Short mmCIF file of C-alpha atoms and ligand atoms in Angstrom, two decimals:
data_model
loop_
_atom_site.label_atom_id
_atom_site.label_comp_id
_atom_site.label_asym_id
_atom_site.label_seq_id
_atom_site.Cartn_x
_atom_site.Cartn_y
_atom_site.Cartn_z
CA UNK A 1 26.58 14.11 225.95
CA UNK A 2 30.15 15.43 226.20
CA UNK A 3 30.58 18.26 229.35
CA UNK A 4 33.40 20.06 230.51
CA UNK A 5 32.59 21.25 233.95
CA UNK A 6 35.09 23.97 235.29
CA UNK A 7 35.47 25.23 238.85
CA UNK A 8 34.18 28.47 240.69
CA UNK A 9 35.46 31.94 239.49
CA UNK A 10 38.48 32.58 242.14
CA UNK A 11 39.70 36.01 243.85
CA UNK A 12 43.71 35.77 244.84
CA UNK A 13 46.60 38.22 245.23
CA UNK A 14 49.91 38.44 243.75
CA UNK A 15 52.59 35.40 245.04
CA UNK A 16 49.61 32.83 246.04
CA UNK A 17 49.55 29.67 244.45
CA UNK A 18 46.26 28.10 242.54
CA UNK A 19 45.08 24.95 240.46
CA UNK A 20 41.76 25.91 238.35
CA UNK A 21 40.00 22.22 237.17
CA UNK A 22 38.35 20.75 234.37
CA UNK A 23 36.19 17.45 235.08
CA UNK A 24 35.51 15.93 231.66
CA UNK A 25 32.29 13.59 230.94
CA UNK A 26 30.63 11.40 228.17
CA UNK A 27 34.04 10.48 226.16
CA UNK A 28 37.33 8.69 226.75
CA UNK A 29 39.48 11.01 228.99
CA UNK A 30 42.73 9.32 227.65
CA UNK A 31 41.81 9.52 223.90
CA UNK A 32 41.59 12.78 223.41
CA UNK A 33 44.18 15.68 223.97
CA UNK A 34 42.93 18.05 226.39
CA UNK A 35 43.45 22.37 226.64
CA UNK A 36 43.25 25.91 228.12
CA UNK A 37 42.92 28.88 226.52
CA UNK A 38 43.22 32.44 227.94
CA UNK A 39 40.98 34.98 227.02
CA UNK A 40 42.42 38.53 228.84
CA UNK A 41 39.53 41.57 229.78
CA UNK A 42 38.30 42.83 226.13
CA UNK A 43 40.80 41.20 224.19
CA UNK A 44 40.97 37.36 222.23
CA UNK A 45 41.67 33.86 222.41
CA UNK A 46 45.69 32.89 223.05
CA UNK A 47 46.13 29.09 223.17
CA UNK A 48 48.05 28.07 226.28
CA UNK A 49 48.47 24.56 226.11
CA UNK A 50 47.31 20.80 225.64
CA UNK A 51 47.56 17.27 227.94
CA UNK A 52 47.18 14.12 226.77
CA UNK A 53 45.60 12.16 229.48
CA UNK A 54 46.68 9.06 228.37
CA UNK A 55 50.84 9.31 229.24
CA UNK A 56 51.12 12.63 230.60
CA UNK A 57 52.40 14.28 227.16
CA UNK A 58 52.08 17.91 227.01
CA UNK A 59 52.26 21.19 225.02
CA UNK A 60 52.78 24.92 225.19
CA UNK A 61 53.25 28.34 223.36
CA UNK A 62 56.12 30.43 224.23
CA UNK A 63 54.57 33.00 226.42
CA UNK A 64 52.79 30.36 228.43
CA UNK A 65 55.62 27.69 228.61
CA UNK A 66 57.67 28.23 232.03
CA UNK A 67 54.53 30.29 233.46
CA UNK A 68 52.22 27.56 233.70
CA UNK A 69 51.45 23.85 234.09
CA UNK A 70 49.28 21.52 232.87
CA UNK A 71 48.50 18.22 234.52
CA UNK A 72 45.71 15.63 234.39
CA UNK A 73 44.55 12.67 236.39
CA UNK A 74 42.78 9.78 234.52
CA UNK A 75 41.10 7.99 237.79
CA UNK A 76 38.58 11.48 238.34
CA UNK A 77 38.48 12.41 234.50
CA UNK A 78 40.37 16.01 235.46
CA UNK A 79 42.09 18.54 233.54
CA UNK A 80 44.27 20.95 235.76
CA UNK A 81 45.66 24.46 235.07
CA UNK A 82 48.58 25.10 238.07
CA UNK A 83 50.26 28.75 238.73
CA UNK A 84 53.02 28.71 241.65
CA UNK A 85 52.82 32.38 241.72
CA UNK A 86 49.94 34.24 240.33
CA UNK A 87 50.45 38.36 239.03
CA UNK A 88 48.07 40.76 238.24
CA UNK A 89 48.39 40.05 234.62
CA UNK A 90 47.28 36.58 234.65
CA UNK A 91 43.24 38.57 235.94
CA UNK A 92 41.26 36.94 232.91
CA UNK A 93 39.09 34.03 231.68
CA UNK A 94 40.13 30.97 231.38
CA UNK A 95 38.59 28.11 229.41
CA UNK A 96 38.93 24.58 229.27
CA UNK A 97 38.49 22.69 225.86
CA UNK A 98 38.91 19.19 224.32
CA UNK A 99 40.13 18.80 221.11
CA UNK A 100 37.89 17.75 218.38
CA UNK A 101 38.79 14.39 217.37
CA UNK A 102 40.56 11.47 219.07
CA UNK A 103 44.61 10.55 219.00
CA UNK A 104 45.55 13.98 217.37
CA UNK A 105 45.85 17.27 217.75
CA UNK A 106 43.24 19.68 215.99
CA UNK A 107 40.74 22.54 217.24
CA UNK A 108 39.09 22.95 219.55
CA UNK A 109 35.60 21.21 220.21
CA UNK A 110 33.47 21.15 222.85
CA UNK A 111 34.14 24.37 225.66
CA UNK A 112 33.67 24.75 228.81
CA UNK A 113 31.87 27.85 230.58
CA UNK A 114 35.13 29.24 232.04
CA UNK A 115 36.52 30.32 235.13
CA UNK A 116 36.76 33.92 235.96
CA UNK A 117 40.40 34.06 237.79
CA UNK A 118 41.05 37.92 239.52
CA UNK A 119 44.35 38.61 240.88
CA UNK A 120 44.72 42.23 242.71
CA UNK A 121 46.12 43.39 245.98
CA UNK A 122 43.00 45.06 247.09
CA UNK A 123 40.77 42.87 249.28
CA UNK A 124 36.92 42.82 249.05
CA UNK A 125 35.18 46.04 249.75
CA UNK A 126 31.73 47.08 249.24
CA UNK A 127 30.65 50.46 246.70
CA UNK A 128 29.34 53.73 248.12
CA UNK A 129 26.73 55.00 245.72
CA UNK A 130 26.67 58.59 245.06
CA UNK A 131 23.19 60.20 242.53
CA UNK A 132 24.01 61.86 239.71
CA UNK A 133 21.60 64.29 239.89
CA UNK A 134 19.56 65.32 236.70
CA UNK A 135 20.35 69.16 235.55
CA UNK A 136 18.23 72.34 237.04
CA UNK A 137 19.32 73.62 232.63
CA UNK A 138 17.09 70.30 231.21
CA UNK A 139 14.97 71.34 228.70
CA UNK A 140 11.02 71.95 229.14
CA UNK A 141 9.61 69.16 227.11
CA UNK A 142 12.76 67.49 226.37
CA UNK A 143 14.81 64.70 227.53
CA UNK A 144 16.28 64.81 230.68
CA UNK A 145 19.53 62.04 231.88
CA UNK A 146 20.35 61.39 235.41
CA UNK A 147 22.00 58.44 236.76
CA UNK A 148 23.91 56.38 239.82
CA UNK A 149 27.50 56.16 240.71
CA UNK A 150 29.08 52.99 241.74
CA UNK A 151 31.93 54.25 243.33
CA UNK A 152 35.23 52.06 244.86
CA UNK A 153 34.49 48.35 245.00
CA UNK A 154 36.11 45.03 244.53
CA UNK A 155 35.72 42.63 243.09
CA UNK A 156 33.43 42.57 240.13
CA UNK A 157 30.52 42.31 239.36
CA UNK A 158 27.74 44.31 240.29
CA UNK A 159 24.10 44.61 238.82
CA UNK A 160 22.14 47.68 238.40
CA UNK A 161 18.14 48.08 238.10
CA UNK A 162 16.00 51.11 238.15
CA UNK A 163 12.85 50.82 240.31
CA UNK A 164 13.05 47.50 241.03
CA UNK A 165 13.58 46.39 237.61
CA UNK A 166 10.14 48.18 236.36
CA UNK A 167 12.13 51.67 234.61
CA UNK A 168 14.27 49.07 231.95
CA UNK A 169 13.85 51.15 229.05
CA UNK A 170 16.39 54.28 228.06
CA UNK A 171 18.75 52.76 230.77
CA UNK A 172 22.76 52.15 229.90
CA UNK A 173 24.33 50.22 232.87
CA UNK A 174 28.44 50.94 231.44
CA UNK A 175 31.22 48.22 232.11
CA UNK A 176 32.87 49.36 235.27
CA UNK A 177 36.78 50.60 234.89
CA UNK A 178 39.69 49.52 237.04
CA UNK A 179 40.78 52.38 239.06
CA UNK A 180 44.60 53.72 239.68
CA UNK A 181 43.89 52.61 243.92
CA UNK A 182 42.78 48.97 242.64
CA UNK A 183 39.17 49.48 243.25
CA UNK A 184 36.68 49.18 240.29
CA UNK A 185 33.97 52.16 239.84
CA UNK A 186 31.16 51.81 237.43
CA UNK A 187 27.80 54.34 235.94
CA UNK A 188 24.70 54.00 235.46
CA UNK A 189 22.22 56.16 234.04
CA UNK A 190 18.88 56.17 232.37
CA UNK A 191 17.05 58.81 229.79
CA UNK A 192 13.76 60.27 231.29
CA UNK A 193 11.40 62.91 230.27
CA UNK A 194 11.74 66.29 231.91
CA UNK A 195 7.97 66.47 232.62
CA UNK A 196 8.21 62.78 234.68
CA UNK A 197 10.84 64.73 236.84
CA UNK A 198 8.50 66.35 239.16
CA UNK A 199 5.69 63.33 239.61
CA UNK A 200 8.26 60.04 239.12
CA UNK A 201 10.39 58.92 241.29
CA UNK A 202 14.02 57.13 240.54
CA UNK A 203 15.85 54.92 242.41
CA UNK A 204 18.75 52.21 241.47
CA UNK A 205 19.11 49.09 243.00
CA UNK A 206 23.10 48.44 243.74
CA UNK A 207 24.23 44.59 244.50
CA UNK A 208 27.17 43.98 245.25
CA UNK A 209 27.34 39.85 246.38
CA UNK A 210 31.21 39.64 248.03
CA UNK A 211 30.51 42.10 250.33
CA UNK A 212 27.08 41.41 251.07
CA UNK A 213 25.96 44.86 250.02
CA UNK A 214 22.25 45.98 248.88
CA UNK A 215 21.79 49.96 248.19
CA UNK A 216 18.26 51.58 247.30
CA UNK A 217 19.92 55.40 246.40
CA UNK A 218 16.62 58.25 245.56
CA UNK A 219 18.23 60.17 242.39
CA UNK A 220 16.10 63.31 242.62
CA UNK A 221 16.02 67.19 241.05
CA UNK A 222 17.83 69.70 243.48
CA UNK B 1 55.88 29.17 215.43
CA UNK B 2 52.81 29.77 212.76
CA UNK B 3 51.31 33.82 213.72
CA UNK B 4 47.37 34.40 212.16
CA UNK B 5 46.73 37.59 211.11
CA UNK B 6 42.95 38.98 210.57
CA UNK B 7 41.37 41.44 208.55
CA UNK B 8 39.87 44.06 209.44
CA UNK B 9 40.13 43.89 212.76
CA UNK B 10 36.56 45.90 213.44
CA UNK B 11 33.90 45.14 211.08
CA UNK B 12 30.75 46.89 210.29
CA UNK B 13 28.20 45.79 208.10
CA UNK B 14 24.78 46.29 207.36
CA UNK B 15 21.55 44.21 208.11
CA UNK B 16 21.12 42.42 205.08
CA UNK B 17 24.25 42.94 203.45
CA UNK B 18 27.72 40.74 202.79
CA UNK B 19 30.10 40.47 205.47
CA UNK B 20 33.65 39.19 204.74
CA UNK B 21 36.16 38.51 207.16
CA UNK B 22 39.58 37.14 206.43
CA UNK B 23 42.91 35.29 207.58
CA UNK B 24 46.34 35.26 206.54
CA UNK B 25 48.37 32.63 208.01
CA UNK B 26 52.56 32.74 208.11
CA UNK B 27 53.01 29.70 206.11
CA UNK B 28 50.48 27.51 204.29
CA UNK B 29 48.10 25.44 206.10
CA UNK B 30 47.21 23.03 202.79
CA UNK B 31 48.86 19.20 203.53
CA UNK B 32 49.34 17.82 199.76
CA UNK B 33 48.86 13.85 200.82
CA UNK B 34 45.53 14.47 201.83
CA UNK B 35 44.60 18.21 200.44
CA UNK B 36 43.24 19.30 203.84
CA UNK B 37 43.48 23.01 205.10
CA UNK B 38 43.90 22.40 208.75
CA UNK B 39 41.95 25.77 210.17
CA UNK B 40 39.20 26.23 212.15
CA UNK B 41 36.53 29.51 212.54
CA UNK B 42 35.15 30.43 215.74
CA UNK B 43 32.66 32.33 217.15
CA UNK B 44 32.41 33.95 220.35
CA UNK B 45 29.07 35.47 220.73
CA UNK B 46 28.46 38.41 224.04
CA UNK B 47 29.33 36.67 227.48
CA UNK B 48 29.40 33.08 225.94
CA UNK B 49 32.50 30.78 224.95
CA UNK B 50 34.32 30.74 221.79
CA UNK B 51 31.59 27.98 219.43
CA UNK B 52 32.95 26.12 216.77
CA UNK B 53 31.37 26.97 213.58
CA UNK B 54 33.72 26.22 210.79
CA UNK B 55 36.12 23.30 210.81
CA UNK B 56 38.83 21.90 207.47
CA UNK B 57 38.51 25.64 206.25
CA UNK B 58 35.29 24.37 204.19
CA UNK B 59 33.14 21.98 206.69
CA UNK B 60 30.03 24.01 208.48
CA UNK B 61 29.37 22.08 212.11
CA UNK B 62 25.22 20.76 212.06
CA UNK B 63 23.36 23.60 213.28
CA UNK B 64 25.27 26.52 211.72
CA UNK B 65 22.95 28.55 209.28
CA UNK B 66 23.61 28.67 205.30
CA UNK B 67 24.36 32.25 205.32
CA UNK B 68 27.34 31.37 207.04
CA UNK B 69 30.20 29.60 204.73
CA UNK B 70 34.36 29.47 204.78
CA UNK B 71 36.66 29.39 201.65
CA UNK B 72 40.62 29.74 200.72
CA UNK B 73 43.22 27.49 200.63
CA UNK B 74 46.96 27.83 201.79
CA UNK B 75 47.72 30.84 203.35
CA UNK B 76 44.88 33.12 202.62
CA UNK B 77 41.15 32.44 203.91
CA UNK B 78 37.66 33.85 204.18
CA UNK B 79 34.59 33.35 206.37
CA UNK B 80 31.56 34.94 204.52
CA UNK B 81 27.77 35.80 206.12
CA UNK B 82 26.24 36.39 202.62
CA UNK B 83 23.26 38.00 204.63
CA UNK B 84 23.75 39.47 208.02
CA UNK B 85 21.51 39.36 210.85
CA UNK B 86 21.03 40.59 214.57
CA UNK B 87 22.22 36.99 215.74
CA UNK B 88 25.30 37.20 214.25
CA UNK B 89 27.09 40.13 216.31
CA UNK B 90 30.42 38.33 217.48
CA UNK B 91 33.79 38.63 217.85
CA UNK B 92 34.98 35.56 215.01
CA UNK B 93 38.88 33.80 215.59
CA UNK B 94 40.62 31.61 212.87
CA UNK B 95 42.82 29.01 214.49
CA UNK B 96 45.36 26.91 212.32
CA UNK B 97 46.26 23.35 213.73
CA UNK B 98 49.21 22.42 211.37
CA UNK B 99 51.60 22.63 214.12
CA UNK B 100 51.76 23.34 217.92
CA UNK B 101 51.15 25.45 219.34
CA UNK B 102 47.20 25.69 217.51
CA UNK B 103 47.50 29.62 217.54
CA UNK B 104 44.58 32.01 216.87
CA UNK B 105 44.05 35.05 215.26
CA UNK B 106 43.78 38.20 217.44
CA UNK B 107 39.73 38.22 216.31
CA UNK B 108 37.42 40.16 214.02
CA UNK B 109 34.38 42.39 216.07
CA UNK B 110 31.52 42.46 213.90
CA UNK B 111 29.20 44.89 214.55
CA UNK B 112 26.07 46.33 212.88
CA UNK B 113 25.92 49.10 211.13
CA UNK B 114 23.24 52.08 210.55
CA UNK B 115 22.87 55.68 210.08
CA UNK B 116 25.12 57.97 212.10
CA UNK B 117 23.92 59.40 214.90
CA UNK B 118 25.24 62.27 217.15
CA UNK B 119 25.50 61.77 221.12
CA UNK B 120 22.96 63.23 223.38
CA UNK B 121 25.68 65.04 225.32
CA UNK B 122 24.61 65.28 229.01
CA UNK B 123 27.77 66.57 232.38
CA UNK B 124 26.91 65.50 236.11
CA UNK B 125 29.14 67.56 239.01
CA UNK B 126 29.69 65.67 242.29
CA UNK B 127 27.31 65.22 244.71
CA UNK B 128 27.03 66.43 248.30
CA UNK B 129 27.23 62.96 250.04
CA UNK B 130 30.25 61.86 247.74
CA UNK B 131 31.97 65.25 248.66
CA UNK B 132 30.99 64.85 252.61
CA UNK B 133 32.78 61.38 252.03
CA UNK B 134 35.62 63.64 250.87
CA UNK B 135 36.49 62.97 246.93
CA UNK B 136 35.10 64.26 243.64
CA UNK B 137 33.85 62.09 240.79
CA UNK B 138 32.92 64.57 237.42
CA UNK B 139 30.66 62.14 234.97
CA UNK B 140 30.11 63.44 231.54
CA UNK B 141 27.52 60.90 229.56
CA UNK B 142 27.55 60.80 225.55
CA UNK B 143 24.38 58.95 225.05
CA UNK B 144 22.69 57.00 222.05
CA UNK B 145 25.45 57.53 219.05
CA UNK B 146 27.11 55.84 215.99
CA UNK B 147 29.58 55.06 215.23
CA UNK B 148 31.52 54.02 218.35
CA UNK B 149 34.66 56.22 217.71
CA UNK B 150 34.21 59.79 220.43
CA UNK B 151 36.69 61.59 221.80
CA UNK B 152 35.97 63.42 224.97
CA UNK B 153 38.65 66.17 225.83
CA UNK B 154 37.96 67.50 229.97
CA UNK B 155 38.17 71.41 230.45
CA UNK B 156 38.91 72.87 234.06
CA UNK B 157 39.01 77.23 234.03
CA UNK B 158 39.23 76.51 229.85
CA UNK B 159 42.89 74.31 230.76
CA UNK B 160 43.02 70.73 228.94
CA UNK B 161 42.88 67.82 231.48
CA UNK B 162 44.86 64.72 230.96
CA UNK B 163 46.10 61.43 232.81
CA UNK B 164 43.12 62.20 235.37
CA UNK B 165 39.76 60.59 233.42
CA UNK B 166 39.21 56.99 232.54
CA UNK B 167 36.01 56.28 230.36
CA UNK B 168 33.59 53.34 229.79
CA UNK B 169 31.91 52.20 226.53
CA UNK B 170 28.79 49.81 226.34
CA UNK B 171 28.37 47.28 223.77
CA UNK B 172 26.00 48.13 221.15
CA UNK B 173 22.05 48.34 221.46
CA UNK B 174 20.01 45.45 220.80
CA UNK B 175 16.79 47.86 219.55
CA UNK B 176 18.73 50.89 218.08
CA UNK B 177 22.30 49.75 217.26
CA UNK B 178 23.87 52.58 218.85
CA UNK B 179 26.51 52.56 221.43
CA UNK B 180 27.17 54.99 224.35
CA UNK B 181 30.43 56.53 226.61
CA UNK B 182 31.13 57.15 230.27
CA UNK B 183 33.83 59.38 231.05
CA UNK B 184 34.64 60.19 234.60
CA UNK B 185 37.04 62.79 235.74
CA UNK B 186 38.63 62.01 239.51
CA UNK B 187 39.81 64.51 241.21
CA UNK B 188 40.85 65.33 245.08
CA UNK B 189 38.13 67.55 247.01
CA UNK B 190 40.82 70.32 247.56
CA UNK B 191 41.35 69.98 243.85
CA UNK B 192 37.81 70.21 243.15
CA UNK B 193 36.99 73.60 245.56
CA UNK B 194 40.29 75.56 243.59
CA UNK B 195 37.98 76.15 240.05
CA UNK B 196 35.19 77.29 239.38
CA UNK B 197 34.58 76.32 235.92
CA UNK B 198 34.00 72.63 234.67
CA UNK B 199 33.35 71.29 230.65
CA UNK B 200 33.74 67.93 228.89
CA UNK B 201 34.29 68.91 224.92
CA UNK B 202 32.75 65.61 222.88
CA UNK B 203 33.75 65.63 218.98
CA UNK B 204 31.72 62.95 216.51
CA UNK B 205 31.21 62.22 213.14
CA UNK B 206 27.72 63.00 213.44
CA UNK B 207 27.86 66.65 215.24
CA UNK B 208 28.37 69.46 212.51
CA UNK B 209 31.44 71.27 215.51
CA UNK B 210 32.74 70.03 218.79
CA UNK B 211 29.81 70.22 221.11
CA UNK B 212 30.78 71.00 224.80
CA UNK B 213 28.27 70.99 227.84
CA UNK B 214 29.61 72.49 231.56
CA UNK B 215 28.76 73.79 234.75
CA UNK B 216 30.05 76.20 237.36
CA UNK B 217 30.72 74.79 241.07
CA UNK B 218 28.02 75.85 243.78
CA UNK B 219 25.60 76.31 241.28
CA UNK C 1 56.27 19.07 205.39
CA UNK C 2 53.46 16.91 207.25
CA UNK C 3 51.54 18.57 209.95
CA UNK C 4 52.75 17.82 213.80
CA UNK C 5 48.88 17.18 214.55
CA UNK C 6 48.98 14.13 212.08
CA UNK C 7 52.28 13.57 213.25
CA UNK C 8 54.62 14.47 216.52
CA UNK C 9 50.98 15.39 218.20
CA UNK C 10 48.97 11.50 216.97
CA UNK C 11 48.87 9.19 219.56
CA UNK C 12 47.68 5.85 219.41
CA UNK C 13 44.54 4.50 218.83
CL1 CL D 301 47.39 32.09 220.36
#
């Protein structure tokens, strides 16, 4: 079977250098033109580039040509992806693809899984979570919403769970949003009944890996 | 250079129904030698890769369904889902190869579509340990609505806030097909202790007038 | 009017 592994999903700041990878499997590496494509937070595919393995040959778009460079080495069966100086706008996915038939250029087939590439000033820091407390004004024998706040962290991601993953239902865990200091801050918040408030307790589970953070916050009725 | 243009760029369809999404290329992708269309559909399901699914313009890869089909020649083309599904929520790229660079098309979200439905409007002041910590985060939650376009206007002593309140949108619901919004208004604790009173004013489709939930501070 | 895949892009085989 034909793979495309791709390394680990890198945190950098602006004016370091890095070289993302590609180690092809189960076809000729030489063959077959070789690619990255960038894929930018909540926005599409823009084709970078292609290498052929088999002299060195290359291609490029215009906003990519000059910015970055592709190499390969036939020996290790390795696809590269080189920036000299990395900016804050180059924070996005970036997969590695072969091209879908041998000695020519075409789409794009198979993938790889990607690597997640962050570039920020901020260094890692782990979140403070505050309870968004559900209203005194909920309505008797209505619905009643309180949540968690995942407040200034970096970098992404972290996973929310309600009672140690037993309340899943009525819950909306929102994509966090990348704050003006450089710190991400996410919600989450689940739908209850208003009679449960009294009897049932709520607590979310914050994880947040970099930092080696774990947070068990009580959301409860003033 | 060859630039792909799709339409529409958001698509909403219903279970069962037709869904047609299209491309328009710069210049014609149809070689007359050997009457090939070089362009290729893609799609990129929720935290996956991009899949191939169509290649030639008119060549299904084994596994794709028989709903699923692509059609057009030169410039203009078509995927088509003659019967949509739950599966088959994706953002979908056309990508001529006719000349490098192999560009894309900016993509085509297709989403589900049902009835609409009116956000459960819900506002959360800050709390006591985030304001010992010395800041002050006000949440208002839209929750369970359709269709995904809200606007959320922040009201501080009945004065219009703006450039102070980033939001956050989920994807949409697996079980219920609705989607629903996050907006948080930051502001500095000093800030916070000047007013008094605090409203987020949500307009939708759904709701009949601008609905607006608030609270006063120490209360 | 040939295609740079078939063309400038092919390699050989
Ligand atoms: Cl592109």
């Amino acid at each position: 079977q034909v793979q495309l592994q791709q390394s680990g999903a890198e945190v950098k700041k602006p004016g370091e250098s890095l070289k993302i990878s590609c180690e092809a499997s189960g076809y000729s590496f030489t063959n077959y033109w070789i690619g990255w494509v960038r894929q930018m937070p909540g926005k599409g595919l823009e084709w970078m580039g292609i290498i052929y393995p088999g002299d060195s040959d290359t291609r490029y778009s215009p906003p990519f040509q000059g910015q970055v460079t592709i190499t390969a080495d036939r020996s290790i069966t390795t696809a590269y992806l080189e920036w000299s100086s990395l900016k804050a706008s180059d924070t996005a996915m970036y997969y590695c693809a072969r091209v879908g038939r041998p000695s020519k250029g075409g789409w794009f087939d198979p993938w790889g899984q990607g690597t997640l590439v962050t570039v920020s000033s901020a260094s890692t820091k782990g979140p403070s979570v505050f309870p968004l407390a559900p209203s005194s004004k909920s309505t008797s024998g209505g619905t009643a919403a309180l949540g968690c706040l995942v407040k200034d962290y970096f970098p992404e991601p972290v996973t929310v769970s309600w009672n140690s993953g037993a309340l899943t239902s009525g819950v909306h865990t929102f994509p966090a949003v990348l704050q003006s200091s450089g710190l991400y801050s996410l919600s989450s918040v689940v739908t209850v009944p208003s009679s449960s408030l009294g009897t049932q307790t709520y607590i979310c589970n914050v994880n947040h890996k970099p930092s080696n953070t774990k947070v068990d916050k009580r959301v409860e009725p003033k | 250079d060859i630039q792909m243009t799709q339409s529409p760029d958001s698509l909403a369809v219903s279970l069962g129904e037709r869904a047609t999404i299209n491309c328009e290329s710069s210049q014609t992708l149809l070689y007359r030698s050997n009457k090939k269309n070089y362009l290729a559909w893609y799609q990129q399901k929720p935290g996956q890769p991009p899949k191939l699914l169509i290649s030639w313009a008119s060549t299904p890869e084994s596994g794709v369904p028989d709903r699923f089909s692509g059609s057009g020649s030169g410039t203009s083309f078509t995927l088509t889902i003659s019967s949509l599904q739950a599966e088959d929520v994706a953002v979908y790229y056309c990508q001529q190869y006719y000349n490098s660079p192999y560009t894309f098309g900016q993509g085509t979200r297709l989403e589900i579509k049902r009835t609409v439905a009116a956000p459960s409007v819900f506002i959360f002041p800050p709390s006591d340990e985030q304001l010992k910590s010395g800041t002050a985060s006000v949440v208002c939650l839209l929750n369970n609505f359709y269709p995904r376009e809200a606007k959320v206007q922040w009201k501080v002593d009945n004065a219009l806030q703006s450039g102070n309140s980033q939001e956050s949108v989920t994807e949409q619901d697996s079980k219920d097909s609705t989607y629903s919004l996050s907006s948080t208004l930051t502001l500095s604790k000093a800030d916070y202790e000047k007013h008094k009173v605090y409203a987020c004013e949500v307009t939708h489709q759904g709701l009949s007038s601008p609905v607006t939930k608030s609270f006063n501070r120490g209360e | 009017e040939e295609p740079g895949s078939e063309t400038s892009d092919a390699k050989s085989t």
